[PDB]
Design a protein around this ligand. Structure first.
Ligand SMILES: Nc1ncnc2c1ncn2[C@@H]1O[C@H](COP(=O)(O)OP(=O)(O)O)[C@@H](O)[C@H]1O
Ligand SMILES: Nc1ncnc2c1ncn2[C@@H]1O[C@H](COP(=O)(O)OP(=O)(O)O)[C@@H](O)[C@H]1O
Ligand SMILES: Nc1nc2c(ncn2[C@@H]2O[C@H](COP(=O)(O)O)[C@@H](O)[C@H]2O)c(=O)[nH]1
Ligand SMILES: Nc1nc2c(ncn2[C@@H]2O[C@H](COP(=O)(O)O)[C@@H](O)[C@H]2O)c(=O)[nH]1
Lengths: 215, 216
């Protein structure tokens, strides 16, 4: 079944608390639908993880290089997260044509894109998908289980999750998916990414996440 | 005194330095000494006002969502995050100052952005970048705590930021360095630079030896 023409030019923006499973789910999608999606390679000033390569998951740059690019107008959006800078360059999106663009960004980037996308020529109409953990306890077990972050970074990431989840609870994302069972969540992501009939209503109710557990 | 040098009127003076060094203190005296000469760029920030601050004077105080909407709409010449809050210079804030010489109080990320962005404006913008240094790390800490407006967590973030700010400053790339030791001495140098009076390019200080490990 082919990708819906009505979503090919609508970038799919996936966001959610660190550790929820964004990278893991995207890998299942690209395996299930090869040569269909383009993953936007963001710039970041954080250091690479063992499984990461420069030019694959991120373009890893220094803070001075990052801010030079910002001043040069190279970024569609950028923001600071957990003490490091991240952003989507125009060139990273251009590199993905003609596949449907997929971006993995956080809330400040989402807010920028909601303002900026209508002002592009031609206007861009992203789809904003929020990927939720099934519980805060599972979020913490996944984030610590990944084993790539310092204790200081985990604290910053859990603190950021408070504002990310607070915004998510306002109901403004286009689709919500709870990443409980990987296969069930992956099937929903595939439906959303392919734009198949029913994708807008294929999503989940946000769980009752008491944010005080993030303290 | 003599009028402002025409050669610097259209060169924005960008002042930066570690939080607590004395930027606001010195600028307040500069503007009282030279009224109707300078325009102070009113940045946007998402931090909360301090007791002695008024919306529209020191800052345009906005929410984070308002700030990011403005960013996405292209309203900012530069912006950055500092100490967990956002700050930025809107194009409209500088337009509001013409024809006065623009004075900006921004941090290092904004400086780096402007160094890349100013040459690309039409016409090109040629700022003067001034670094204001504390005389010692111990005096930076006592000034920052003595102001009495920040939480302990905010002080920690500001001192941590000072490490990167001073590391960059030590590279020697600023146009002028002024050590804020004696307020009157530093004020005279700042006025000379802001007015562009003869000698301003050579009036600056050598950056002191500052042990950045003391910031912890
Ligand atoms: N549905 C799931 N069930 C169990 N573990 C999962 C699931 N999804 C992801 N994980 C694991 O959780 C951790 C965080 O996933 P990751 O994709 O790195 O998150 P993110 O990109 O959102 O920060 C990884 O160790 C990953 O293998
Ligand atoms: N030269 C100086 N000597 C002693 N204290 C100073 C001096 N300059 C400023 N201060 C004090 O240090 C504190 C920080 O000054 P401020 O102007 O608010 O710093 P900044 O704007 O760089 O963050 C204030 O309490 C101020 O009165
Ligand atoms: N705004 C923005 N956030 C990004 C970008 N790239 C990654 N992020 C976000 O930064 C956070 C941290 O990513 P990580 O360090 O775990 O790879 C995640 O929420 C991720 O979505 C980007 O290009 N822009
Ligand atoms: N980049 C940038 N930094 C700013 C701006 N306004 C204030 N800052 C910087 O933010 C830091 C904190 O400012 P404060 O909270 O003490 O007023 C200072 O270093 C100040 O120069 C702005 O418009 N842009």
């Amino acid at each position: 079944r082919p990708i819906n023409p009505d979503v090919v030019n609508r970038p799919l923006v996936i966001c959610g608390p660190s550790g929820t499973g964004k990278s893991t789910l995207l890998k299942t999608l690209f395996e299930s639908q090869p040569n269909t999606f383009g993953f936007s390679v963001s710039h970041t000033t954080r250091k690479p993880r063992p499984g990461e390569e420069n030019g694959r998951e991120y373009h890893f740059v220094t803070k001075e290089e990052f801010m030079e690019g910002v001043g040069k107008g190279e970024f569609l959006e950028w923001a600071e997260f957990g003490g490091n800078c991240y952003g989507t360059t125009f060139a990273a999106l251009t590199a993905l044509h003609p596949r449907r663009c997929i971006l993995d960004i956080e809330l400040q980037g989402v807010l920028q894109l909601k303002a900026k996308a209508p002002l592009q020529t031609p206007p861009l109409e992203p789809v904003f998908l929020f990927l939720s953990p099934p519980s805060i306890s599972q979020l913490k077990s996944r984030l610590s289980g990944r084993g790539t972050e310092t204790d200081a970074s985990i604290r910053k990431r859990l603190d950021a999750a408070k504002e990310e989840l607070r915004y998510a609870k306002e109901g403004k994302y286009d689709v919500y998916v709870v990443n409980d069972d990987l296969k069930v969540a992956g099937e929903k992501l595939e439906k959303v990414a392919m734009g198949w009939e029913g994708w807008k209503t294929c999503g989940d109710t946000l769980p009752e996440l008491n944010l005080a557990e993030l303290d």
